[PDB]
Amino acid sequence: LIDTAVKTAETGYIQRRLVKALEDIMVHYDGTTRNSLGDIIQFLYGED
């Protein structure tokens, strides 16, 4: 009961930082994967 009650907030914080790191990443019409600055993260999404 302690573990479930404690470690739920540990993983809740993990998910929050992950979402903010990745929220602006979108597939564009040329197949590239880019963020809001237009930086290329992958030249083709999922490599396939």
Partner 1 sequence: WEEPRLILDQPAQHDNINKRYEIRFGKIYLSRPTMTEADGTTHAMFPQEARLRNLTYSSPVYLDMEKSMFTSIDGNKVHIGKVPIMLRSKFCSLRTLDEVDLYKMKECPYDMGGYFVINGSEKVLIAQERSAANIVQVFKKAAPSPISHVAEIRSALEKGSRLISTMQIKLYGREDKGTGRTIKATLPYVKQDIPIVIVFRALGVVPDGEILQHICYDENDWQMLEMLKPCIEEGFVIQDKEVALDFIGRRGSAALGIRREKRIQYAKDILQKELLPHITQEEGFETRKTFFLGYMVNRLLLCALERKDQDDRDHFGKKRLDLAGPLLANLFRILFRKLTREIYRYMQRCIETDRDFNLNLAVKSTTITSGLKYSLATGNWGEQKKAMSSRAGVSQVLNRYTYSSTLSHLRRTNTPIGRDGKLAKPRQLHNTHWGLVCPAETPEGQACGLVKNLSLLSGISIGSPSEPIINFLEEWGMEPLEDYDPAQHTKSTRIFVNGVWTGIHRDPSML
Partner 2 sequence: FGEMERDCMIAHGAAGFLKERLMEASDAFRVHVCGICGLMSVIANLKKN
For partner 2, give the closer residue by CB, 23 or 39. Answer: 23
Stretch in the footprint of partner 1 (CB under 8 A) among 1-9, 13-21, 29-37, 38-46: 1-9
Site map (CB under 7 A) of DNA, residues 1-40, x = contact: ----x--xx--xx--x------------------------
| 14 within 8 A of 22, measured Cβ to Cβ | no
| 25 within 8 A of 34, measured Cβ to Cβ | yes
Does 19 sit near partner 2 (CB under 8 A)? yes
Q: What is the dihedral of CA 33, 28, 13, 10, to 10 degrees?
A: -50
